[PDB]
Each structure stands twice: as C-alpha cells, then as structure tokens.
Amino acid sequence: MTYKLILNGKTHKGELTTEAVDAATAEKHFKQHANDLGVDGEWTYDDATKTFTVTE
Amino acid sequence: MTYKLILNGKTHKGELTTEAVDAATAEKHFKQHANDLGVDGEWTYDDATKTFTVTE
Numbered sequence A, B: 001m002t003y004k005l006i007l008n009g010k011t012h013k014g015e016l017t018t019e020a021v022d023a024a025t026a027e028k029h030f031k032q033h034a035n036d037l038g039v040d041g042e043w044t045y046d047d048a049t050k051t052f053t054v055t056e
C-alpha cells in the first residue's frame, strides 16, 4: 500500500509517499528519511489514511 | 523566500519546502535531500513559483 509521511519540522515541511508491503516496512523507511531531513519530533500514525506525521 | 522541491522518483514521490535567503541556498539544500532520498533525475526550476522538480 502507499503510505505517506507528513513532516512538520522547524526547517523542513512537506509530504513523502512510498509503496510498502506492510506498515512496519514503510515506517522504518520513513524514520530513515526524517533523520536524513533533520526532523526529530513526535510521531503519530493514522491507519485509515496510511499516514505518519512527525511534528517538531 | 519559501522554495519547494517536487520529487517524482520511482520509489519516492512528494514535496518538501524550505525557507532560504536565495535560490542557490535552497537548491544546494534540496540537492542534498534528493541525494538522501535516493532520487537521481532531471532537474527543472520555475522561478515564478520558486519550485524545483526532480524527475526520474
């Protein structure tokens, strides 16, 4: 399924999508990108919309 | 000004924004993120909308 990451960082905002066979696969993928983009915040997940948010 | 990066990659799609004092500052910032997200493609820039696109 297609998962989305919403980044609400102080220096980086936006949205990334990726295809993953399960939610853990997508979340590990996304935690790597949030690290890469310097966004260290609070994580939430919405299963209905397959959307992770990271908020600084 | 706020610049945007549109990523149209095979494995990563989405949009990132950042504030930068000039376009070269934003583009260097964004080229680092596209590298980080594994998106190596053709770059275009639209000055009217301060938008870089990278397309695989």
Ligand SMILES: [Cl-]
Residues within 6 Å of the ligand: A001, A002
């Ligand atoms: Cl799917």
Ligand SMILES: [Cl-]
Residues within 6 Å of the ligand: A011, A012, A013, B016, B017, B018
């Ligand atoms: Cl950004």
Ligand SMILES: [Cl-]
Residues within 6 Å of the ligand: A011, A012, A037, A038, B029, B033
């Ligand atoms: Cl950055």
Ligand SMILES: [Cl-]
Residues within 6 Å of the ligand: B001, B002
């Ligand atoms: Cl500004």
Ligand SMILES: [Cl-]
Residues within 6 Å of the ligand: A016, A017, A018, B011, B012, B013
């Ligand atoms: Cl992605």
Ligand SMILES: [Cl-]
Residues within 6 Å of the ligand: A029, A033, B011, B012, B037, B038
């Ligand atoms: Cl990735």
Ligand SMILES: [Zn+2]
Residues within 6 Å of the ligand: A001, A002, A019, A020, A021
């Ligand atoms: Zn799928």
Ligand SMILES: [Zn+2]
Residues within 6 Å of the ligand: A011, A012, A013, A037, B016, B017, B018, B029, B033
């Ligand atoms: Zn950034």
Ligand SMILES: [Zn+2]
Residues within 6 Å of the ligand: B001, B002, B019, B020, B021
């Ligand atoms: Zn500005």
Ligand SMILES: [Zn+2]
Residues within 6 Å of the ligand: A016, A017, A018, A029, A033, B011, B012, B013, B037
């Ligand atoms: Zn990705």
